[PDB]
Amino acid sequence: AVQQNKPTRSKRGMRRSHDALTAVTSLSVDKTSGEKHLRHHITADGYYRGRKVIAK
Amino acid sequence: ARVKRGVIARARHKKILKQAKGYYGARSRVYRVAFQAVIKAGQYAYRDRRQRKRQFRQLWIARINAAARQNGISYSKFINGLKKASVEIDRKILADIAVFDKVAFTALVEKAKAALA
Amino acid sequence: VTGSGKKPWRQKGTGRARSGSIKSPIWRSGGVTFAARPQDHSQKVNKKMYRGALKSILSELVRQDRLIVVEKFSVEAPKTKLLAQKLKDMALEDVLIITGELDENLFLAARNLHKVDVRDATGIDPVSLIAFDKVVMTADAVKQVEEMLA
Amino acid sequence: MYAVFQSGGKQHRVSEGQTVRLEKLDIATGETVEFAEVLMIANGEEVKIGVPFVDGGVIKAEVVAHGRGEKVKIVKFRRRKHYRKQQGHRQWFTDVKITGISA
Amino acid sequence: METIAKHRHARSSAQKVRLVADLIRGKKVSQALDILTYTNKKAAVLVKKVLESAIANAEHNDGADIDDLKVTKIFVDEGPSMKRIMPRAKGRADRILKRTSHITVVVSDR
Amino acid sequence: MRLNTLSPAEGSKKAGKRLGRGIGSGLGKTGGRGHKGQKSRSGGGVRR
Amino acid sequence: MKTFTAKPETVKRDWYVVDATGKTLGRLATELARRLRGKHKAEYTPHVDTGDYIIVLNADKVAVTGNKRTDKVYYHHTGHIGGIKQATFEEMIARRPERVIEIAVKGMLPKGPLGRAMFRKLKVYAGNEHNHAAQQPQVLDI
Amino acid sequence: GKPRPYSPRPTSHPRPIRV
RNA sequence: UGUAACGGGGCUAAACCAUGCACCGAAGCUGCGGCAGCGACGCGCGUUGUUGGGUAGGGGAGCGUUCUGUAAGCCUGCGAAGGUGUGCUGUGAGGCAUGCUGGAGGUAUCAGAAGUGCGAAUGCUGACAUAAGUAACGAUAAAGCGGGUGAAAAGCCC
RNA sequence: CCCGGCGAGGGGAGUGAAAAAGAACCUGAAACCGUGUACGUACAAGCAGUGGGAGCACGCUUAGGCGUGUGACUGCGUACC
Ligand SMILES: *[C@H]1O[C@H](CO)[C@H](O)[C@H](O)[C@H]1NC(C)=O
Ligand SMILES: [Mg+2]
Ligand SMILES: [Mg+2]
Ligand SMILES: [Mg+2]
Ligand SMILES: [Mg+2]
Ligand SMILES: [Mg+2]
Ligand SMILES: [Mg+2]
Ligand SMILES: [Mg+2]
Ligand SMILES: [Mg+2]
Ligand SMILES: [Mg+2]
Ligand SMILES: [Mg+2]
Ligand SMILES: [Mg+2]
Ligand SMILES: [Mg+2]
Ligand SMILES: [Mg+2]
Ligand SMILES: [Mg+2]
Ligand SMILES: [Mg+2]
Ligand SMILES: [Mg+2]
Ligand SMILES: [Mg+2]
Ligand SMILES: [Mg+2]
Ligand SMILES: [Mg+2]
Ligand SMILES: [Mg+2]
Ligand SMILES: [Mg+2]
Ligand SMILES: [Mg+2]
Ligand SMILES: [Mg+2]
Ligand SMILES: [Mg+2]
Ligand SMILES: [Mg+2]
Ligand SMILES: [Mg+2]
Ligand SMILES: [Mg+2]
Ligand SMILES: [Mg+2]
Ligand SMILES: [Mg+2]
Ligand SMILES: [Mg+2]
Ligand SMILES: [Mg+2]
Ligand SMILES: [Mg+2]
Ligand SMILES: [Mg+2]
Ligand SMILES: [Mg+2]
Ligand SMILES: [Mg+2]
Ligand SMILES: [Mg+2]
């Protein structure tokens, strides 16, 4: 089964109306280190909710 | 004696494409489609020059019929009465008066009514 | 066109337009449909028609003051400066000088000059008569031309 | 006050000062034309319904310009019949400014 | 002061990169960098370098305070595609397009 | 009488028929050959 | 000049109230359609709604001639196979009296966006009471 | 431009014979 | 398949028969402007009549393109060709001017000669679309973790 | 010199008449794909035009109509070979 007519750029873009990516609503700030991180994730420097969970 | 067609061919296609501005999709971008559309636009324009004359008269007659009826006479009887009185204003002008000068239009109606009487 | 007579692909089944030669003119690198051959563009001009045309041209030249009939036209040495001086003195820049005895010195002196051509009375051609602005003719040449054309 | 006069096969409801475009007239630019057959004149309650022309009604106008109208393209095309014809057209016109209208 | 950085011939189809680009369009450079940081896309990596390069250019060449910079214009143009051959069943070949992209990020105070 | 003033007598030079060059020409498409048949074929035609 | 065309931003529509009691269905619907479309106004433009707001009262008492009260059938399909549904005039009046008038007028209005807009100006009430007194409808004999 | 076509390859289904 | 044997709404006339008088209604006819073909008539034009839907096809008259002479002329770094806008202009194929781009060619006129006009040929070559960010990523023998290196490690090293 | 992986790519600087002549280099069309701006578009049925036509934006030499762009609504209209 294939198209009988080429779809238009309009239809192509209409289908892609739902393809838009969404960015994180907001980044959380560590109380101790002050770094930003995804909520519920350790900071890049290994701090979670004010505690150095992993070293270096 | 070899002739290259690029420069001339380009101009012809540009001409048709320029006449196809505003057209949807391929109709305004692709020559094969733009060409067909430009031709059909011309066929429609030719046919519609005559239709413009038909539609406006239709509009004029309806406006006259509305205005006349408000004055207590139908369109068929008003035109008949106008001819008996020998008035020769065209339907275009009658319609214009019917919208802009109702006092004058009422005068034409009374004259038409007297001619019938 | 260089290539083989092999059919590029089978006649049926491929889904492509039928082909028979890679040298087809509908194909890039294919042969020219009506390729040119060496041609001879010479036309036949009836002797009378040719001579008649010459007489018409000569007549216009006279009517238009484009024929300077002089008895003698010559230069001392085959030097361009000499003929250039003579032509400015005569007040002619573009001229076709016809002489009865094409002078060798005159042939050499006018060779470099491009608006000046020196020909004998037997070398006149129709286009040269019409092309050059003036047609200086020596007394000898005029008689020769009249006698030749008769 | 306005007036209706038939010019160039068509009628026109005009008021003094209104420039009108009529079918081409053989009248020089500076010249002035008079349309005698005034179909109707109206001054409020005053309404002169010419039957067919308002007696003594005359519209005085000065020619203001003679020119060709917008180019119209006439395209004729018979489909599948190897027939297609093209033609242009620029209708000639005459603009007239109403100098005056006389009851 | 519109400083511009461009990653030309960036391996990645424009369609994919355009997804990420739409996110940071009109966003302060700082907010943009964060959004790029936590976007799980290869294009996010590509865009971030161009965005960072643009910020660096504004400061080094145009002495623009980074705090004021914002992503004024960001757009992805299709680049030259690399033509490849992918074998298929029954001896049939299917050309493959390796689509590149040109990423242009523009930063300015206004 | 100059090389850019000589002209042919009226009627001496008639332009040839160029076939297959559009509807306007009048010899476009079929080029006067009509529709199908042996005569319309290239190299077609019965012997004398 | 160019023929005047009614302008929707300036058109002045008026409110009327009609009583359907005794009025023959079709003959009444035609007048509504004309007035809804603006065909009674010299400013009528076929592409602008110049009509007027018309309120109909006592839609349940509209009259019909012959044996239409029982024989006239209003058919509709629901878009489901075997979905043809038929309601007679008497049935329609009892169940949905206003629909009897609305269908007639809607069938007599232009078909398309503007026709739908013209239909929105018809307020059909099955009884002798309406709630548009603020609009002050002017009694209109039909 | 289009590439040179392939020679007959194995076919998935028999052509229907209409007769 | 759905009313589905007035196009519909609706109609007791908004049906039908008769009589009559209005009106609507076409690219028909007339009015107004313009163009062309043909025939008369006068003096080259004017005046008058009339004609102008077209396939195959016949007849006539043109536009434009490259090339030769005219042209060791003319135009052109004070911006050629080409590109791309804009305005004007002819009944058409067109033409002319001009902004920008371009960076060195172009070419009046009247003649001459053609590889002289493309949308189709399942045409040929190249480029780019569509399906679509879809199917799939090639044996279902299988991976997990620590450390290392690194800009980055599920895949590399240990 | 700066960002970048002692990357790719780029921003400066400099050369040049010119760097949108930077080597993927003369000119740089079209298909095709984007960013920005103006107008329209989420009660609306079909060759997507044409004939009418409101509103809105813009630039104009009365404060004026005009020009340009868009085109709600509406008549007619089933591509080409
Ligand atoms: C493939 O097609 C051929 C004809 O081209 C035969 O019909 C053959 O039987 C087909 N293959 C199969 C598996 O039936
Ligand atoms: Mg099909
Ligand atoms: Mg998706
Ligand atoms: Mg050449
Ligand atoms: Mg365009
Ligand atoms: Mg060759
Ligand atoms: Mg001989
Ligand atoms: Mg194999
Ligand atoms: Mg023919
Ligand atoms: Mg054929
Ligand atoms: Mg046959
Ligand atoms: Mg035959
Ligand atoms: Mg043969
Ligand atoms: Mg309709
Ligand atoms: Mg192809
Ligand atoms: Mg049934
Ligand atoms: Mg008519
Ligand atoms: Mg006629
Ligand atoms: Mg004819
Ligand atoms: Mg150079
Ligand atoms: Mg020449
Ligand atoms: Mg050819
Ligand atoms: Mg064709
Ligand atoms: Mg493809
Ligand atoms: Mg799918
Ligand atoms: Mg799926
Ligand atoms: Mg999958
Ligand atoms: Mg590991
Ligand atoms: Mg593995
Ligand atoms: Mg291991
Ligand atoms: Mg570099
Ligand atoms: Mg280049
Ligand atoms: Mg382009
Ligand atoms: Mg609804
Ligand atoms: Mg809406
Ligand atoms: Mg639809
Ligand atoms: Mg329709």
| Structure tokens that stand for B83 in this block | 């001819």
Nearest CA to ligand 1 atom 5: H11
Distance separating alpha carbons of residues B92 and F11, to the nearest angstrom: 55
- Ligand 4 geometric centre to CA of B12 (Å): 21
Q: What type of residue is E64?
A: A
* Distance in Å, alpha carbon of H16 to nearest chain E alpha carbon: 22
Calculate ∠ Cα C32-C35-C38, nearest 5°: 155
Distance separating alpha carbons of residues F35 and A41, to the nearest angstrom: 81
Strand I interface, G 92-111, C-beta < 7 A: 103-108
Point out the residue among D10, D39, D75 whose CB comes nearest to the CB of B39.
D75
Backbone angles phi, psi at B56, to 5 degrees: -65, -40
State whether the beta carbon of D69 lies below 7 angstroms from any atom of strand I.
no
State whether the beta carbon of F19 lies below 7 angstroms from any atom of strand I.
no
Chain J positions under 7 Å from a protein CB? 1-4, 7-12, 24, 29-36, 43-45, 47-55, 69-76, 79-81
Q: What type of residue is F19?
A: L
Neighbours of F7 (CB within 10 A): 7
- Ligand 22 geometric centre to CA of E94 (Å): 36
Calculate ∠ Cα B64-B67-B74, nearest 5°: 75
Chain I positions under 7 Å from a protein CB? 1-4, 8-14, 22-27, 31-34, 54-62, 64-67, 69-72, 82-86, 89-95, 108-119, 121-133, 138
Count of domains for chain B: 1
Instruction: Give the ranges where G22-86 is alpha helix by DSSP (H).
Output: 25-37, 68-71
* Interface contact G75, partner B, CB < 8 A: no
| Structure tokens that stand for C91 in this block | 């007040």
The closest nt to B60, taking CA to C1', is I24
Q: What type of residue is E70?
A: K
Alpha-carbon Rg for chain B, nearest whole angstrom, is 25
Calculate the alpha carbon distances from G54 to E44, E104, G15, G107 in Å: 62, 61, 6, 16
Distance separating alpha carbons of residues G79 and C53, to the nearest angstrom: 93
Q: Which residues of D touch B108 (CB under 8 A)?
A: 49
Determine whether the shortest distance from the Cβ of H11 to ligand 1 is under 6 A: yes
Describe chain H by its helix, strand, coil percentages, rounded to 5: 0, 0, 100
| Resolution for this PDB entry, in angstroms | 2.8
For chain G, the structural domain boundaries read: 1-142
* Interface contact C7, partner H, CB < 8 A: no
Half-sphere exposure of residue G22: CA atoms within 13 angstroms, side-chain side: 2
Calculate the alpha carbon distances from C1 to C29, H1, H4 in Å: 8, 21, 20
Q: Which DSSP string corresponds to chain C?
A: --S----SS-SSSSSS-----TT-TTSTTPPPTT------------HHHHHHHHHHHHHHHHHTT---EES----SSS-HHHHHHHHHHHT-SSEEEEETT--HHHHHHTTS-SSEEEEETTS--HHHHHHSSB--EEHHHHHHHHHHH-
Residue that the structure tokens 């007194």 belong to: G133
Neighbours of B105 (CB within 10 A): 24
Asked if residues B88 and D38 have their Cβ atoms less than 8 Å apart, the reply is: no
Distance separating alpha carbons of residues G72 and G62, to the nearest angstrom: 14
Answer yes or no: do D84 and F29 touch at CB < 8 A: no
Answer positive or negative: Cα dihedral of E40, E43, E46, E50: negative
To the nearest 10°, the Cα dihedral for D36, D38, D44, D46? 80
Ligand 1 atom at minimal distance to the Cα of residue H8: 5
Count of domains for chain D: 1
Q: Which residues of D touch B92 (CB under 8 A)?
A: 11
Residues 6+ away with beta carbon under 8 Å from C145: C58, C98, C121, C124, C137
What 3-state DSSP class applies to A32? coil
Angle between helices E29-37 and E14-24 (to 10 degrees): 130
Distance separating alpha carbons of residues F13 and D74, to the nearest angstrom: 34
State whether the beta carbon of G68 lies below 7 angstroms from any atom of strand I.
yes
Count of domains for chain C: 1
Q: What type of residue is C68?
A: I
Nearest CA to ligand 1 atom 12: H13
Neighbours of D103 (CB within 10 A): 14
E65-84: burial string, b at 16+ Cβ within 10 Å, e else: eeeebbbbebebeebeeeee
Asked if residues B34 and B20 have their Cβ atoms less than 8 Å apart, the reply is: yes
Indicate left, alpha or beta for D85 from its phi (over 0: left) and psi (-120 to 50: alpha).
beta
Neighbours of B77 (CB within 10 A): 14
Instruction: Give the ranges where B1-117 is alpha helix by DSSP (H).
Output: 6-19, 31-70, 75-85, 91-100, 102-116
* Distance in Å, alpha carbon of H2 to nearest chain E alpha carbon: 12
Asked if residues A27 and A36 have their Cβ atoms less than 8 Å apart, the reply is: yes
Distance separating alpha carbons of residues C112 and B40, to the nearest angstrom: 66
The structural domains of chain E, ordered by start, are: 1-110 (3.90.470.10)
Distance separating alpha carbons of residues E79 and E96, to the nearest angstrom: 15
* Distance in Å, alpha carbon of H6 to nearest chain C alpha carbon: 7
Calculate the alpha carbon distances from G60 to G15, G21, G57, G88, G97 in Å: 21, 8, 8, 14, 5
Beta bridge partners of G57: G19
Distance, Å, D10 CA → I29 C1'? 17
Backbone angles phi, psi at D37, to 5 degrees: -75, 75
Indicate left, alpha or beta for E82 from its phi (over 0: left) and psi (-120 to 50: alpha).
beta
DSSP H or E run through D35: strand D32-35
- Ligand 14 geometric centre to CA of E64 (Å): 65
Answer yes or no: do B102 and G4 touch at CB < 8 A: no
* Interface contact H13, partner E, CB < 8 A: no
To the nearest 10°, the Cα dihedral for B24, B29, B33, B37? 50
Alpha-carbon Rg for chain E, nearest whole angstrom, is 17
Residues 6+ away with beta carbon under 8 Å from D89: D71, D72, D73, D74
- Under 8 Å CB pairs connecting chains E and H tally to 6
Determine whether the shortest distance from the Cβ of H7 to ligand 1 is under 6 A: no
Residue that the structure tokens 């990653």 belong to: E7
Using an 8 Å CB-CB cutoff, list residues of chain A that contact chain B: 8-10
| Structure tokens that stand for B64 in this block | 């006259």
What 3-state DSSP class applies to B57? helix
Q: Which residues of E touch A19 (CB under 8 A)?
A: 19
Asked if residues G57 and G97 have their Cβ atoms less than 8 Å apart, the reply is: no
Q: What is the CATH number of the domain that holds C99?
A: 3.40.1370.10
Subunits next to H (3 or more Cβ pairs <8 Å) are C, E
Q: Which DSSP string corresponds to F23-39?
A: TTTSS-TTTTS-SSSTT
Distance separating alpha carbons of residues E47 and E10, to the nearest angstrom: 10
Instruction: Please name the method used to determine this structure.
Output: cryo-EM
Pick the closest to residue D77 from B10, B47, F30 (CA basis).
Answer: B47
Domain span at B64? 1-117
What 3-state DSSP class applies to A26? coil
Q: What type of residue is E84?
A: R
Distance separating alpha carbons of residues G142 and G31, to the nearest angstrom: 7
* Distance in Å, alpha carbon of D87 to nearest chain F alpha carbon: 12
Calculate the alpha carbon distances from B87 to B64, B82, D7 in Å: 15, 5, 16
Half-sphere exposure of residue D58: CA atoms within 13 angstroms, side-chain side: 6
Distance separating alpha carbons of residues C83 and C108, to the nearest angstrom: 10
Determine whether the shortest distance from the Cβ of H14 to ligand 1 is under 6 A: yes
| Structure tokens that stand for C112 in this block | 């470099």
Residue that the structure tokens 């391996």 belong to: E11
Domain span at C86? 1-149
Residue that the structure tokens 């270096």 belong to: A56
- Ligand 25 geometric centre to CA of A4 (Å): 14
